[PDB]
Design a protein around this nucleic acid. Structure first.
Ligand SMILES: Nc1ncnc2c1ncn2[C@@H]1O[C@H](COP(=O)(O)OP(=O)(O)O)[C@@H](O)[C@H]1O
Ligand code: BEF
Ligand SMILES: [Mg+2]
Lengths: 576, 88, 95, 93, 107, 82, 98, 107, 93
DNA sequence: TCAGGATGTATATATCTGACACGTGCCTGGAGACTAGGGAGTAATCCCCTTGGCGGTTAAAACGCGGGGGACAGCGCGTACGTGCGTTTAAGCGGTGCTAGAGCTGTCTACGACCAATTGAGCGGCCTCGGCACCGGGATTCTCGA
DNA sequence: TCGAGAATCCCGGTGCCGAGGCCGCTCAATTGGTCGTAGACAGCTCTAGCACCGCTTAAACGCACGTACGCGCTGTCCCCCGCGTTTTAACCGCCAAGGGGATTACTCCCTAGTCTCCAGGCACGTGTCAGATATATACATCCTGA
């Protein structure tokens, strides 16, 4: 049907190659591979993956072609950029001017791998007040430098300057941040004049709905920018499961793979190592308290606006996020024993903390913003387990400073708070272990985005992940919809996982086995309070099962209970 | 403070001493007494209640949940102060 | 340092010169929403409506400060006082 | 030529409120001009509300909203109460 | 059947029929509903009943059993809400509420 | 028959009485002429509106109804005269 | 010595007296001749009903009474018990009549 | 025959037909004459021509070839008669005429 | 949905008075609300004059008197002049 | 009175963009043509309310004349507000995710316009009679010089 | 703190013209029927409104300090009030002429209404320049000292 895109877009590949300046051959026609690193790279270990990926992107370079990196995480996009420029322009020596743009969450990091992992290529950053910039682009106003390392909004404010000069090869990170082409960032990147070579780095493709596949491949490529309105009906594959999966899923998705092979590149951690300790992913469940649970039927019965979604997420996390509720509960608002006795998250939290500090293993936790992190700070300060804090409104100084404060292995603090949106891209850690997520992924790409910050190349520990959810609430329905979406892109990105070298048999292997997984969760579609069950998560060996029995003579043995006037009064004040 | 915010001054206080100061500078006022601010906030609250009750009345009559620009224009013209440029 | 009263006059010419809106958006919008809560709960506001209330409110306060300035100057004083405001609102018939 | 007025009706209402009190002719004229005034006000506001919402029929709802616009506060509340009771009893029987 | 007046159905003393005619021929709208004259007549009855109530109270306070325009001036202006409604009105033979500013009194 | 100096027919004791009713305690000697000017302006307005109504009706007589429609026209409603 | 009242007492007694009654404070014939003179400049040979002249007298007297009320408010705001022309034209300037 | 617009007969740029429709459906009177839309449209043309004339003069004085609401504020308030007509109007983005009381200036 | 306005007409008159000067969209909206305002004023006064004199037809005379009531002074004189000339030329040809 | 500096304010050139001016397909409202009928114009008559005059009464206005209190100028004190600087802090702008209700359509039906028949509520003319204006006298109260 | 005394309230008596009830006499309000149609209700689309956070930076806030002006006090003088006397024009009551409002009878022609036909104007695009912004440079003005 559309194979006019097959032959016509192959001849169109000739159009990019010659006219602009098996898909495994005609698109890749200029060939090379080298398993030796560029001579500029210093202080690093050479694995197999960034070789094939290295000369793969170099194969995109020689042919004058763009690309996207579809890989999992931890494969060192930074390494491929460093070795990229240092190898390429170790040969040609042009070496600049070249632009790289990254999230502000990690900026001085990228400069830190621009420090130890290679010298001789300078960097222009942008941070802080306009004064330091005045020094920087006032000195370099004449345009002499190897590389500019900048961030998002500084091409929006500094687009009046840095877009005047000519550019060649730009590096933009986290394509999910790019997302829509209607956003001002996109249409203002056309105000940026032109840079011949391009690229996009991402830890995961776009939203499950995927109308913006347009926007993506428009900013990524000359291919489809002619006809904007085309593929919206051709997206019907994702939205008689055998026959509908066949026509829709099998037809349209076979077409998507047929077209999209020589662009995205994805691998795994088990492919490069197998040192990944487990699947390292679990979940848990929790209970509620009647005094809080009445807010479900009463406050859901209030039906003022937008609360029905906002009300339940808070009350299962904190009652105290509401000002009037926290005021009527206690006037004194001093640190109290009943702060952690109002919900079950703090009860089981007070259950795990003695075993957390006991085992000596640390924990990462993700949160909602504003009052949630504040109250969690109040609890971790209440039982006095020291913690770092991080979030969107903090400066870059203590952003990098706190990042360095983590890197000390002598650390006496185990847990600490980090923002899903702000800090999910904010760190790169080989030494972490345990992860916890309250928010339950309003987008799955954010939870899997910040999720991989635990398991990393050279992980000497064993990762365990926990999703803390309470029963009889809207949040486990949000988890329902969450892995519903994980299936929605499960026909897209989990279809995109077998595409690296354009294999053959593995796609139907993941169709039969993975299809048994989506059928398994078709069964899934339609307690742990005792010490042993909670011991099972963090044990990972019998040795930890034995050493956690020392915490059973207090939490259980112990030489009040969880649970009215606050319910009636709460109903009075919340009736506004 | 840092543990719990308690940073809320409500709203009508969100109209700032420099704001009212600027509104007086436009009117031709040279020097301002220190007590003008509370009275100005009171007057502003009065006028806003008077206009908003009418706009909400026109909104409820049409059986709509959205307060549009035409409702506010008909409330201002309703009270004798005509406004142009937003429709009418 | 400038003699007191010069900066005030330069501000008079400056703000009387331009059309700029003198009240910040978000605080005024939250005020409008608070005042509207007492009438009907869960209301939706269009941006042009809030802009309308800002136009009428700012113009009304500007005129009120004009007449108040006339009262203060009639009293042989260059400093407006609350009794000047409530006097102007008493003569206009608004109270 | 017969020129009608509200005189006898204001007289009846006066005899309901104060059976022992009479009214001068001039005060009756003031009451007449008052009733005509308020009548033209409510009818005018009803015409405006009917025109802005694009409807060709004046019903009790437009008169109600007009009363709520013209009469401040308790006059509006008690007025809407009495009127709603009157339409209620009217259509009920 | 014997015709019963619509004013007697709702219990109103005012001419619902006359109000209906004035709404029809008043060039207000093209069509007039069936509840408009009843509701409007009721509102007019409430207002008239209130102003005549205050007028009767003022007349009783002045030891006069016949209401005069002075009693309407006093009865209105002494009431806050009716003063807010009628603030733009000039009543003939009304007079002015007795008032003296406290600063003008001797001491 | 040209009429002149009839506004002087308004007497100093008259305006004095109006101020005595208005709450004025003591009157300056310069109030009078200004009050005559203001009254003359007001009468020019109301009378030009009323005479306009009378001209539109092709009538030679100015009815009290025309004056009431002129006052209500200006925003001051006068009850009792129709 | 002949008994004389302290200045300002007769003025207050007149305030209570005229604020007590409904009497019209302007004589008929002069006001009527004034109305006719003012009306001569618009259309010649006009007829006036008595109730019309009475209407202009009601509206005019009430308007001047209110004007002297607000003028009194201005004079008292100036810390003076004597109204001045600048108080009048001030009130007419604030009302928006000029 | 070829239909000629009534606006072109009287030499008016405004839609005499549209004004006639608005007079018919505006619930003003029961019947509308044949001279009302022409005369009224002409009056509106005079007023609009005047206010746009003053607005154009103010725009030319401010060295701007595009009329802005500020030029309407100045063009109106600087004229006496249009200020008397529009005295109750609040123009959006209008601003205020530059003014300082002579007593407030230093000496 | 087609929402008509006076925009193009104010544009034509502007090109008659000042051919070289353009107008912003916001100022065009202000002119539109102005024309609608004055229109509703003259039409309302014409309705009142037609009702008080007991006539069911609005003619050029009622619009003329309404213009003489609303527009002060020279605006009324020149307005009545231009309008009378327009009706003259209209019915003459 | 008059020169020098620092700040804000105006002017000249470059540049860069988002709102404005113009062309286009289309469709619904405006123009033309024809007809009926009822409202407005127009002649004729009736009467009542306006204008004009005159004469007698008298309350009210003009004119003057003391004098006491308030408007107004001057002067001095103290404190409250302008002004500038370092420090926070939310406003502004952007960007994501959801979905409630604005906005339009399509039926379909109760509801109001309209005309014929009928009659009783309200009104103009017409009678009482009593609540209130007016007055005359006495008791009471509030103002002013001892 | 108190009497002389002038103004005011109170009470009893008297005369009158408007309030209040009655009675024909309509003509508009009520009832009974139709007939077309505005909007009530259900359904569908999809736009803008809602919440929230990230991130930067112009504005607000707190504070130190000076001096400009608000306000209290005093003295001066002038001018407006309280009262007596004198004059005049309002007022009231009556009488008379008449013309302009008010109505009714007759007629005609201007506009509502409907049908037919088409182009003036409107949403949607396209290009494109007026001016808003930025940099550089010079003039107006205040504040200081001389
Ligand atoms: N050969 C290697 N030896 C040691 N560490 C490595 C090696 N390759 C990658 N890493 C680790 O990977 C991290 C960089 O990965 P990163 O650029 O964050 O990947 P991505 O950008 O795909 O998430 C570094 O912190 C580094 O410690
Ligand atoms: F290396 Be991943 F971007 F934490
Ligand atoms: Mg990365």
């Amino acid at each position: 049907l559309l194979d006019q895109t097959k032959d016509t877009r192959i001849t169109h590949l000739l159009r990019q190659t010659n006219a602009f300046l098996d898909y495994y051959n005609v698109a890749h026609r200029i060939k090379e591979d080298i398993k030796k690193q560029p001579s500029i790279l210093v202080g690093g270990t050479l694995k197999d993956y960034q070789i094939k990926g290295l000369q793969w992107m170099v194969s995109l370079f020689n042919n004058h072609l763009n690309g996207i990196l579809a890989d999992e995480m931890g494969l060192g996009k930074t390494i491929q950029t460093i070795s990229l420029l240092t190898y390429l322009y170790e040969m040609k020596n042009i070496r600049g001017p070249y632009l790289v743009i990254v999230p502000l969450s990690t900026l001085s990091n990228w400069s830190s791998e621009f420090a130890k992992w290679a010298p001789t290529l300078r960097t222009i950053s942008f941070k802080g007040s306009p004064n330091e910039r005045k020094a920087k682009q006032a000195k370099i106003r004449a345009g002499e430098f190897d590389v500019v390392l900048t961030t998002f909004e500084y091409i929006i404010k500094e687009r009046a300057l840095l877009s005047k000069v000519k550019w060649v090869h730009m590096i933009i990170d986290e394509g999910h941040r790019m997302k829509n082409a209607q956003s001002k960032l996109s249409l203002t990147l056309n105000t940026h004049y032109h840079a011949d070579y391009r690229l996009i780095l991402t830890g995961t493709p776009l939203q499950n709905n995927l109308p913006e596949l347009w926007a993506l491949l428009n900013f990524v490529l000359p291919k489809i920018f002619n006809s904007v309105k085309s593929f919206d009906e051709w997206f019907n594959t994702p939205f008689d499961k055998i026959e509908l999966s066949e026509e829709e899923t099998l037809l349209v998705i076979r077409r998507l793979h047929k077209v999209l092979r020589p662009f995205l590149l994805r691998r795994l951690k088990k492919d490069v190592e197998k040192e990944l300790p487990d699947k390292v992913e679990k979940v848990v469940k929790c209970k509620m308290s009647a005094l809080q649970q009445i807010m479900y039927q009463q406050m859901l019965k209030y039906r003022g606006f937008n609360n029905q979604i906002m009300q339940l997420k808070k009350i299962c996390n904190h009652p105290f996020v509401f000002e009037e509720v926290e005021d009527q509960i206690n006037p004194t608002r001093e640190t109290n024993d009943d702060i952690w006795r109002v919900a079950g998250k703090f009860e089981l939290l007070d259950r795990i903390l003695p075993k957390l500090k006991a085992t000596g293993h640390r924990v990462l936790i993700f949160f909602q913003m504003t009052q949630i992190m504040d109250i969690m700070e109040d609890f971790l300060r209440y039982i006095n387990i020291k913690y770092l804090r991080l979030d969107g409104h903090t400066k870059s100084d203590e952003r990098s400073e706190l990042l360095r404060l983590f890197n000390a292995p002598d650390s006496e603090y185990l847990c600490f708070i980090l923002s899903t949106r702000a800090g999910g891209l904010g760190l790169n850690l080989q030494t972490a272990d345990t992860v916890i997520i309250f928010d339950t992924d309003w987008n799955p790409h954010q939870d899997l985005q910040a999720q991989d910050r635990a398991h990393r190349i050279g992980q000497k520990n064993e990762v365990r992940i926990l999703r803390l959810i309470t029963t009889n609430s809207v949040e486990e329905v949000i988890l329902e919809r969450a892995y519903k979406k994980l299936d929605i892109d499960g026909k897209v990105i989990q279809a995109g996982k077998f595409d690296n070298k354009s294999t053959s048999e593995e796609q139907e292997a993941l169709l039969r086995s993975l299809l048994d997984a989506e059928e398994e969760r078709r069964k899934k579609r339609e307690e742990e309070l005792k010490d042993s069950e909670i011991n099972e998560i963090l044990a990972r060996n019998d040795e930890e099962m034995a050493v956690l029995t020392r915490m059973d003579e207090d939490r259980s043995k112990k030489e009040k209970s969880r649970l009215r006037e606050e319910s009636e009064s709460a109903a009075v004040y919340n009736g506004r | 403070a840092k543990r719990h915010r308690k940073v809320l001054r409500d709203n009508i206080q969100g109209i700032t001493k420099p704001a009212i100061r600027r509104l007086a500078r436009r009117g031709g006022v040279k020097r301002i007494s220190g007590l003008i601010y509370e009275e100005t906030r009171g007057v502003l609250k009065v006028f806003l209640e008077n206009v908003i009750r009418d706009a909400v009345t026109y909104t409820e009559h049409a059986k709509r949940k959205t307060v549009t620009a035409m409702d506010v224009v008909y409330a201002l013209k309703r009270q004798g102060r005509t406004l142009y440029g937003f429709g009418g | 340092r400038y003699r007191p009263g010069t900066v005030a006059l330069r501000e008079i010419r400056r703000y009387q010169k331009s059309t700029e809106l003198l009240i910040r958006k978000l605080p005024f919008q939250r005020l409008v929403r608070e005042i509207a809560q007492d009438f009907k709960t869960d209301l939706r506001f269009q941006s042009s409506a809030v802009m309308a209330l800002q136009e009428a409110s700012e113009a009304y306060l500007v005129a009120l400060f004009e007449d108040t300035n006339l009262c203060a100057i009639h009293a042989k004083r260059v400093t407006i006082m609350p009794k000047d405001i409530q006097l102007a609102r008493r003569i206009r018939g608004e109270r | 030529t017969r020129k009608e007025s509200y005189a006898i009706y204001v007289y009846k209402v006066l005899k309901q409120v104060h059976p022992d009190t009479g009214i001068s002719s001039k005060a009756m004229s003031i009451m007449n001009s008052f009733v005509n005034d308020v009548f033209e006000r409510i009818a005018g506001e009803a015409s405006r509300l009917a025109h802005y919402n694009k409807r060709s029929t004046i019903t009790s709802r437009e008169i109600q909203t007009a009363v709520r616009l013209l009469l401040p506060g308790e006059l509006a509340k008690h007025a809407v109460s009495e009127g709603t009771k009157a339409v209620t009893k009217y259509t009920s029987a | 059947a014997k015709a019963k007046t619509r004013s007697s159905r709702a219990g109103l003393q005012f001419p619902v029929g006359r109000v209906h005619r004035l709404l029809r021929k008043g060039n207000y709208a093209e069509r007039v509903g069936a509840g408009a004259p009843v509701y409007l007549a009721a509102v007019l009855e409430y207002l008239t009943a209130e102003i005549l109530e205050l007028a009767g109270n003022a007349a009783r306070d002045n030891k006069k059993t016949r209401i005069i325009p002075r009693h309407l001036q006093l009865a209105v202006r002494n009431d806050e809400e009716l003063n807010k409604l009628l603030g733009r009105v000039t009543i003939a033979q009304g007079g002015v509420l007795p008032n003296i500013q406290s600063v003008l009194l001797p001491k």
